[PDB]
Design a protein around this ligand. Structure first.
Ligand code: GTP
Ligand code: MG
Lengths: 56, 430
């Protein structure tokens, strides 16, 4: 009977709960942005100063 | 009197222009032939007849667009000299329109603009139109400005350009031409205005009620803004604004000049049955991001000085209350070192409607020119698109073969990077 108890785990057909259709329906959050959106090339990306004379 | 000269470049500039001149001739009361069935001196010249002539020059490197005017109804209005057409276009190549094909016609055009300035006793500025993606618009426009800068010098050269859209694009090589042109524009231009087609499509469908527009409807909306801008010099008003005032008030520095445009009310007029469109209503409609003619939301950035132009029944008492209200709005930011922040003008003449029109004959309207740090969003996109192509050198061979040297590509790329941090440093406060 302990074998029978181990056979019937307390799930009692709370198994296979998530189906293929529901996983299609569920909301998926936004992923990280692609590398293509990042692309400003390095040497210009790194530039330090400006041409505007705002300081005194 | 006081005169303004119009120069039109490329397909966009020319066919925007005939939209502008159909507006003015209808406004002043001049038939298309130049006869009549005031402020004519500001835009037209009189001859030894009852006939008038516009102060305009149309320039393009291919004859199809200009020849439409030559066989059109308006052919009798323009002087045959004013219509200048090349032999073969620049093929959306900046180098071809700047070095090889541009120099074939540059000196022919410069005689004609200079000759027109002789008749302008009280010349105060020029108006120049561009489309950035076109080879002639960017390439030949840069060559025209460089020469014009030394020719006239201390005269206000204003420009009205179409910024390439954030996502809508008609040229693959479009990012290359805009950045190279931006170098020549920034040092020589006194002040230039941005609009983009993508926002003008959205406004013309949402505010105006058209299912399917063409460039014709967009070109008429642009003409209204220029009409309101120039109304101060032509017709009476309680607060006049000259061209030179725009140069000083709007731009805080030399390199940060680029403002954006707005206009209100833009309404399909059956919707105008329901509302009276008071001064407070039109003032509020200016500041919504939906009404911007450039598809960049000001809420990402901040406002520097803004210029307001009112036309029609507006009264100076009602203006002060309206702008006071917009200062209370906490959806609108202003940089700390611009507490004043405003320049206002009032004119009495309401806008003019056109046969086959799109807009209403409303009794009052307002136009806006605002300088904002939100334009830094547009520069980042254009710069990013440029770097993708340039890393693998996707289109350089076409430019180099047409007289361009490669070293101009990174140097023009450096200045935009400086401009990008020019906008970031100014956006800070202390
Ligand atoms: N608003 C508006 N934009 C236009 C119009 N015609 C062309 N454009 C814009 O002009 C941009 C491209 O420039 P082009 O039309 O090629 O002008 P261009 O300088 O003569 O080019 P080339 O043929 O090489 O001489 C496009 O993004 C269009 O959206 C127009 O009638 N109205
Ligand atoms: Mg052309």
């Amino acid at each position: 009977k302990a074998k029978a108890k181990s056979a019937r785990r307390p799930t009692f057909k709370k198994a296979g709960r998530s189906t293929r259709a529901s996983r299609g329906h569920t909301v998926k959050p936004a992923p990280p942005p692609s590398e293509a959106e990042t692309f400003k090339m390095k040497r210009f990306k790194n530039i330090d100063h400006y041409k505007i004379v705002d300081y005194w | 009197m006081r005169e303004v000269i119009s120069i039109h470049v490329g397909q966009a500039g020319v066919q925007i222009g005939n939209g502008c001149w159909e507006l003015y001739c209808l406004e002043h009361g001049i038939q298309p032939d130049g006869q009549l069935p005031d402020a004519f001196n500001t835009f037209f010249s009189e001859t030894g007849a009852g006939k008038h002539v516009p102060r305009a020059v149309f320039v393009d490197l291919e004859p199809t667009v200009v020849d439409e005017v030559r066989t059109g109804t308006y052919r009798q209005l323009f002087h045959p000299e004013q219509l200048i057409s090349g032999k073969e276009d620049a093929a959306n190549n900046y180098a071809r329109g700047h070095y090889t094909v541009g120099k074939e016609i540059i000196d022919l055009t410069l005689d004609r603009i200079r000759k027109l300035a002789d008749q302008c006793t009280g010349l105060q500025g020029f108006l120049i139109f561009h489309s950035f993606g076109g080879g002639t618009g960017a390439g030949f426009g840069s060559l025209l400005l460089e020469r014009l800068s030394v020719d006239y010098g201390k005269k206000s050269k204003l420009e009205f350009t179409v910024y390439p859209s954030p996502q809508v694009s008609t040229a693959i090589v479009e990012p290359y031409n805009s950045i190279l042109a931006t170098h020549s524009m920034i040092d020589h231009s006194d002040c230039a205005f941005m609009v983009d087609n993508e926002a003008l499509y959205d406004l013309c469908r949402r505010a105006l009620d058209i299912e399917r527009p063409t460039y014709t409807n967009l070109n008429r909306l642009i003409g209204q803004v220029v009409s309101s801008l120039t109304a101060s010099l032509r017709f009476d008003g309680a607060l006049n604004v000259d061209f030179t005032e725009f140069q000083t008030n709007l731009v805080p520095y030399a390199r940060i000049h680029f403002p954006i445009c707005s206009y209100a009310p833009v309404i399909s007029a059956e919707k105008a049955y329901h509302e009276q469109l008071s001064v407070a209503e039109i003032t509020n409609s200016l500041f919504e991001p939906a009404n911007m003619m450039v598809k960049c939301d000001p809420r990402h950035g901040k406002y520097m000085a803004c210029t307001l132009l009112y036309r029609g029944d507006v009264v100076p008492k009602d203006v002060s209350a309206a702008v006071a209200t917009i200062k209370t709005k906490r959806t609108i930011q202003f940089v700390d070192w611009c507490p004043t922040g405003f320049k206002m003008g009032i004119n009495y003449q309401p806008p003019t409607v056109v046969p086959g029109g799109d807009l209403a004959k409303v009794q009052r309207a307002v136009c806006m020119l605002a300088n904002t740090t939100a334009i830094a969003e547009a520069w980042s996109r254009l710069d990013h698109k440029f770097d993708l192509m340039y890393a693998k050198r996707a289109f350089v061979h076409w430019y180099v073969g047409e007289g361009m040297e490669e070293a101009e590509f990174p140097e023009a790329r450096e200045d935009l990077a400086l401009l990008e941090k020019d906008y970031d440093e100014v956006a800070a406060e202390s």
